[PDB]
Design a protein around this nucleic acid. Structure first.
Ligand SMILES: NC[C@@H]1O[C@H](O[C@H]2[C@@H](O)[C@H](O[C@@H]3[C@@H](O)[C@H](N)C[C@H](N)[C@H]3O[C@H]3O[C@H](CO)[C@@H](O)[C@H](O)[C@H]3N)O[C@@H]2CO)[C@H](N)[C@@H](O)[C@@H]1O
Ligand SMILES: [Mg+2]
Ligand SMILES: [Mg+2]
Ligand SMILES: [Mg+2]
Ligand SMILES: [Mg+2]
Ligand SMILES: [Mg+2]
Ligand SMILES: [Mg+2]
Ligand SMILES: [Mg+2]
Ligand SMILES: [Mg+2]
Ligand SMILES: [Mg+2]
Ligand SMILES: [Mg+2]
Ligand SMILES: [Mg+2]
Ligand SMILES: [Mg+2]
Ligand SMILES: [Mg+2]
Ligand SMILES: [Mg+2]
Ligand SMILES: [Mg+2]
Ligand SMILES: [Mg+2]
Ligand SMILES: [Mg+2]
Ligand SMILES: [Mg+2]
Ligand SMILES: [Mg+2]
Ligand SMILES: [Mg+2]
Ligand SMILES: [Mg+2]
Ligand SMILES: [Mg+2]
Ligand SMILES: [Mg+2]
Ligand SMILES: [Mg+2]
Ligand SMILES: [Mg+2]
Ligand SMILES: [Mg+2]
Ligand SMILES: [Mg+2]
Ligand SMILES: [Mg+2]
Ligand SMILES: [Mg+2]
Ligand SMILES: [Mg+2]
Ligand SMILES: [Mg+2]
Ligand SMILES: [Mg+2]
Ligand SMILES: [Mg+2]
Ligand SMILES: [Mg+2]
Ligand SMILES: [Mg+2]
Ligand SMILES: [Mg+2]
Ligand SMILES: [Mg+2]
Ligand SMILES: [Mg+2]
Ligand SMILES: [Mg+2]
Ligand SMILES: [Mg+2]
Ligand SMILES: [Mg+2]
Ligand SMILES: [Mg+2]
Ligand SMILES: [Mg+2]
Ligand SMILES: [Mg+2]
Ligand SMILES: [Mg+2]
Ligand SMILES: [Mg+2]
Ligand SMILES: [Mg+2]
Ligand SMILES: [Mg+2]
Ligand SMILES: [Mg+2]
Ligand SMILES: [Mg+2]
Ligand SMILES: [Mg+2]
Ligand SMILES: [Mg+2]
Ligand SMILES: [Mg+2]
Ligand SMILES: [Mg+2]
Ligand SMILES: [Mg+2]
Ligand SMILES: [Mg+2]
Ligand SMILES: [Mg+2]
Lengths: 125, 138
RNA sequence: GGAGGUAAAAAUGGCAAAA
RNA sequence: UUCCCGGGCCUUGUACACACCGCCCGUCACGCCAUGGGAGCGGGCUCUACCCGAAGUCGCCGGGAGCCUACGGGCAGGCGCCGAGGGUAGGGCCCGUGACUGGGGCGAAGUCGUAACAAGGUAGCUGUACCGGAAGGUGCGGCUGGA
RNA sequence: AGCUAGUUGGUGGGGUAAUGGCCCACCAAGGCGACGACGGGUAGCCGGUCUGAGAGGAUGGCCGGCCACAGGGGCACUGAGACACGGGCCCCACUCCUACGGGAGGCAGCAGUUAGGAAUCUUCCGCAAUGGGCGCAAGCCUGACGGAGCGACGCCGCUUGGAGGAAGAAGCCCUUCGGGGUGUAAACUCCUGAACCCGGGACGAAACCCCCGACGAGGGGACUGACGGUACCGGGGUAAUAGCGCCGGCCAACUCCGUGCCAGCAGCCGCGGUAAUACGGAGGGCGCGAGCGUUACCCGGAUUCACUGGGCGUAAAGGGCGUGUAGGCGGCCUGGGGCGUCCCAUGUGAAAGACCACGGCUCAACCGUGGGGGAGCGUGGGAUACGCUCAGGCUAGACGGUGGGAGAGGGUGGUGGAAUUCCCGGAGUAGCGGUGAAAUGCGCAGAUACCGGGAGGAACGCCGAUGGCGAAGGCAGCCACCUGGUCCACCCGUGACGCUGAGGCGCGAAAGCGUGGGGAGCAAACCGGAUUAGAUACCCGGGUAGUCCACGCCCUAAACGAUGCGCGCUAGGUCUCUGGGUCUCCUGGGGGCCGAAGCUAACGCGUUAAGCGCGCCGCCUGGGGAGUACGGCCGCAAGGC
C-alpha cells in the first residue's frame, strides 16, 4: 500500500487465541471426575482411549485424557489437569497428570516415570 | 505531469543502460543538472550538455558501459548496476551525519542534498552536514 | 469456401493402507 | 470398418494418479458439541426524574428561652442550601437461563438418487425469479474459467 | 457517529496559600467531534525488564521516581503540611462484650492463622551498624533496617575421588555361536582428602561522650557487635548421594523379545491390523547433571501486518462505472523569509541497571570505583541544496479559440418493409404438426399447402466485420429535432488553473416489485403425451405472470481485459478503423495478432504491459462455518450494503 494509507489504516497485529481456557492460563487446575469411559478415535485409527469428564474449580465441565496403562478413576475421584490436546480425540484438549491425587501413577512402568507419575523402584538395581 | 522529475530522470537512464543507447534526453532543471555533475565526477557517464529540443532545453547525457564480454550473452557489464530514489515525494527522507548508510560497503555512492549544496556520502561526512538522501548508485 | 456448426439411449463400485 | 470387445501412434480435455471397477454432490436416519431465534425468567453495571435524607462545611436567626472573664462579642442551640446513602418509577448496554425451533461443524464401512469432473452422456459456471424428496431443473440476461 | 446544564464565554462576588464554572447570581449562545468527541471494555505510569541482527514486538515482578487507596462511601476539624493506614464524626456490611440502654474493633505494617488456589516462608535475634523522630546532653522509641531461619524458586561455586589395572572375571544383551558388547568399567594396589574432631578467632567501630585548647578548628583518651565463636586460620582425619529426558524424520543416539488397528505413543508428518529402531520391557547409546522433563505465558523463527521488509490476471485480494468534498501529491526560472531540514555550543536527559576498564569477597554470582555516548526537548548562533510560504516571470502540463472529420453515444416525435399469429372472402382436398422413432394435439363442423383483403404487437434481414461508439451497464431499419463525449490541423489566447480521491452524489444488463396501458411470437410456473426402475428434467403439443410502453422503485453479477486512474521512459514487423500532409511515404489517435530487452512460479504480458519509475484510492493475510447470525442503515417486498 502507499505510505499515506499506512498512517490512516495502519498495520493490524495478529492477537492469537489460547487453545487452553484454563482461567488466566494457569499451569494446572484441580477438578473432580464425574464419568470415566472410552471414546473411539478419528478415521485413520481405531482403539479405546480412556477418558473422563471433569468438573474443575472454574465451574465449567470438560473432557480429559487418561494416559498410561491402567488407572484408578471413579465417579468420585479428584484429579489434576495438565493441558495439551489429543489429535485423534474430538473435544479432548486436556491431559491428566498422575501420581499425587486420587489418580495414581502407572505401576509396573520402567522407562518414563516422570511422565505417567511412577516413583523409583528398588529391586537391587 | 511529472510527479517526480528526479526519479523519472533516474529511470530515463535505467531504460537506456539496459539497451546500451548512446545517449538520452531528459528535461532540464538546475537541481537535476547538479546530480549529473556528481555522476560525472565518480564516472558513471561520459558527461552531458545543454541541448535544445523543439525550442525547449533538455539534457543530452552521454552514457558509459563496460567491455564486450566473451561467451554467451555478449552484453557488456553495466557501469551502473543499480540506481533508485530514496527520498520519494510521498515519503521524505532526511538524515544527519551519524545516520549515513554504508552504500555497497563504500564501493557505491549515496547522493544527498545538503545546505552546502548537493554532495555525496564521502564529502558530506568530511564536511559534516547531512540532509535529504536523494539516491543510491552502485 | 469462409460461416452457421451433430448426440435417443442406460445408474452404481464399502472404508483404510507400501521402500 | 459405420456398430460391440481388445490393442498401437498423434492430439485434445480432465477436479482421475492403489488411476472411470476413478472421483464426487445433496437430502434423509443415529451420536456428540457449539451457536442464533424464542413465550419469558434471573443477574451485574449505568442513566434520568421525584420522595426521604445522617455526619459536616458554609449562610441567616441566636429570640417570649440557657452558659460566658472586658457584652452594639463569643459558645451551645434552631433554621436553610448541598449532601453519603436508602426508596419509588421508567430506560440503555452486557451476561446467564428457557420448553421448542432454524441452519452449522464433527463422528472408519447405514438409505435415496447422478448434480459436477471426459461433449460427465442436457457444455459448465453465474445474478435473479419460479417449482421440485434431494443433489437439482427451468425462464431471461451475461461469462470462457467450453466447442 | 453524534456529545454537551455548569455545558461554552462574560461581569461581579464566595472560596483557596494561589489561577480557574472550583462554587453562586445575572447576561450572551455557545463549546467538542472521522486529526475519532460521547459511550463500552481493559489497565496503575516510568527509569527499565525479556526478546530480536536491527527496526520493532511484548512486559512494568525485585530495586528506584510519580500517582492513587487504608472493609465500602461521604465529610470536616487540627495543623507549615492531611481530607490523614495504626487520629475524629456519620451511614452500610461484618466480629465481639453487655446488667439490653449502648459500647469496643478495622494486618493492603512485621510475623502468623483461616478461606480461595497449581502454588509462595519465621508468631526468630538485635538497635552493634546506617537512617529516622524527640532531647543541650545522657539517653528512649524504631517488625525502617542490619542479620539469622524455611523453600533446588533463579543465578553462581563445589562434592560423590585420582593414578595404575586383563588380549580383557562374573552377571546381563546380541550372534550368520567362530565371537562381539557393557568394559578400565569393576574387583584389586598406591596417593590425595568432602564431611567430621580439637585449638585459635575477626573486619564491619568510630563517632556521639570525656580531657587540653574558648563546649570552635586542631590534638589525645575511653565505651559498645545481634549476626557468632559464624566466616576464616592452624593440626588431625573418612573413598565418601546419582539422577532425569530421549534414541523413525525434523534431531544426536539400535539391536532383541513381548503385543497384533488390541494395548497404546504423539509437537508437526504420523506409527500399531504377525517378523514395529515410532507401543511395552531388556541391553546398549546419545544429551545434560543436583538437576532433568512437562504444562502455561512472552519474543523469536514469522519477510505469515512486510518503515527497514510483502502483495492483488489465473493462488486470498482492483471498488460495477463515473462526477466530485476533505485529504494526500505537484512543471521550469529568479529573489524575501528560514517552518520542516542540517550543524556547533549550552542546559536537561536522577541514581541503579545496560556497555567498557580496574579492583573487593581464595574464583564466579554478587559488589565498589572510573570512563563513554544515545535518541528526545528548551535556549543562543549559523547554513539555504530540497520540501514549505510570500512576490515577479515562463511555457513543454492542463484549458480555451479558428476550421474540419467520423461514429449502433443518449432522449423525444414521426415512419418503412418482410415474416409469425388471428379474423374475413375465394379456391381446394384426407390428412397436417411433431420426433431418434412415436404419441398427445389439430382436422370432412372443410384442417395443411395457395391467392386476395384487414387487424395487432414485437424485432429490424442483406449492408455487417476479426468493424465502430460510450466511463460502465450497454447501444443496429429510416427521417428530423434536442444533446453529450472524442479526434486532427493551425500553433492564436489564458497561464500551473494539475493528478488521484475516504464520505457524499448520479448512472447501473437481466430477473423482480407498484400503478395504468398493451399482448402477435416466445416462454418460468402449470397440464398433458412419450422416455425411464422412477422424470417434478432433457424431447413434443398447449400455456399464465413476464418479455413490450409511460412513471416510480430494487442496486445484483463470470457488472471480466477475473488486470483502478493520471503521467514520463524502453527494438520493431504486420492487419484494420478514422484525421492531416510536400497524400510513394511521413505523421496523430483507436482496435488486433507476432514478438527486443525485461518481468512472472509457470501459463503468459510485451509503447492498448502483468516492463522500468513516481502520486493517490480501494482491497488481501490458511480452508470450512459464511457473505451466515446479531447490531446499524436502506427497501412495498423479495432482499441489498
Ligand atoms: N462436511 C461438510 C458438510 O457435510 C455434509 O455431509 C455430512 C452428512 O451429510 C454426511 O453423511 C454421510 C452420508 O452422506 C453418506 N451417505 C453416509 C455416510 N456414512 C455419512 O457420513 C457421516 O456419518 C457417519 C456415521 O453415519 C460418520 O461416521 C461419518 O464420519 C460422517 N461423514 O457426512 C457429512 C458429515 O461428515 C454435507 N455434505 C454438507 O453439509 C457439507 O459437505
Ligand atoms: Mg562499515
Ligand atoms: Mg445406492
Ligand atoms: Mg486404516
Ligand atoms: Mg506405428
Ligand atoms: Mg486420448
Ligand atoms: Mg462411475
Ligand atoms: Mg461590645
Ligand atoms: Mg459588639
Ligand atoms: Mg434470553
Ligand atoms: Mg437464549
Ligand atoms: Mg438449539
Ligand atoms: Mg461407523
Ligand atoms: Mg448437469
Ligand atoms: Mg452427468
Ligand atoms: Mg452435464
Ligand atoms: Mg438462472
Ligand atoms: Mg420445470
Ligand atoms: Mg485494575
Ligand atoms: Mg525479525
Ligand atoms: Mg481487608
Ligand atoms: Mg493497622
Ligand atoms: Mg488448598
Ligand atoms: Mg539504630
Ligand atoms: Mg541513631
Ligand atoms: Mg563382562
Ligand atoms: Mg571490629
Ligand atoms: Mg584444614
Ligand atoms: Mg541421528
Ligand atoms: Mg515384532
Ligand atoms: Mg525400538
Ligand atoms: Mg522402543
Ligand atoms: Mg518417540
Ligand atoms: Mg515480524
Ligand atoms: Mg511467534
Ligand atoms: Mg514494507
Ligand atoms: Mg505474499
Ligand atoms: Mg477459483
Ligand atoms: Mg481468486
Ligand atoms: Mg474494473
Ligand atoms: Mg472485485
Ligand atoms: Mg515541487
Ligand atoms: Mg528553521
Ligand atoms: Mg542514568
Ligand atoms: Mg507563480
Ligand atoms: Mg502562443
Ligand atoms: Mg476524477
Ligand atoms: Mg436496474
Ligand atoms: Mg426488466
Ligand atoms: Mg411490470
Ligand atoms: Mg409455444
Ligand atoms: Mg433410466
Ligand atoms: Mg414447451
Ligand atoms: Mg468481458
Ligand atoms: Mg497503434
Ligand atoms: Mg506478444
Ligand atoms: Mg480508484
Ligand atoms: Mg448475495
Amino acid at each position: 500500500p502507499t505510505i499515506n494509507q499506512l498512517v490512516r489504516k495502519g498495520r493490524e497485529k495478529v492477537r492469537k487465541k489460547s487453545k487452553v481456557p484454563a482461567l488466566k492460563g494457569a499451569p494446572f487446575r484441580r477438578g473432580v471426575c464425574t464419568v470415566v469411559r472410552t471414546v473411539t478415535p478419528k478415521k485413520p485409527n481405531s482403539a479405546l482411549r480412556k477418558v473422563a469428564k471433569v468438573r474443575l474449580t472454574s465451574g465449567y465441565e470438560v473432557t480429559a485424557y487418561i494416559p498410561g496403562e491402567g488407572h484408578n478413576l471413579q465417579e468420585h475421584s479428584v484429579v489434576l489437569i495438565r493441558g495439551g490436546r489429543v489429535k485423534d480425540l474430538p473435544g479432548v484438549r486436556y491431559h491428566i497428570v498422575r501420581g499425587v491425587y486420587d489418580a495414581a501413577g502407572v505401576k509396573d512402568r520402567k522407562k518414563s516415570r516422570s511422565k505417567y507419575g511412577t516413583k523409583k523402584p528398588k529391586e537391587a538395581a | 505531469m511529472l510527479t517526480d522529475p528526479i526519479a523519472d530522470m533516474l529511470t530515463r537512464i535505467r531504460n537506456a543502460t539496459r539497451v546500451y543507447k548512446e545517449s538520452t534526453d531528459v528535461p532540464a532543471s538546475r537541481f537535476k543538472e547538479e546530480i549529473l555533475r556528481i555522476l560525472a565526477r565518480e564516472g558513471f557517464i561520459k558527461g552531458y550538455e545543454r541541448v535544445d529540443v523543439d525550442g525547449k532545453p533538455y539534457l543530452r547525457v552521454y552514457l558509459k558501459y563496460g567491455p564486450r564480454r566473451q561467451g554467451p550473452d555478449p552484453r557488456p557489464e553495466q557501469v551502473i548496476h543499480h540506481i533508485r530514489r530514496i527520498s520519494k515525494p510521498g515519503r521524505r527522507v532526511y538524515v544527519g551525519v551519524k545516520e549515513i548508510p554504508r552504500v555497497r560497503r563504500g564501493l557505491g555512492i549515496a547522493i544527498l542534498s545538503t545546505s552546502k549544496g548537493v554532495l555525496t556520502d564521502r564529502e558530506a561526512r568530511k564536511l559534516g552536514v547531512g540532509g535529504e538522501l536523494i539516491c543510491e548508485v552502485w
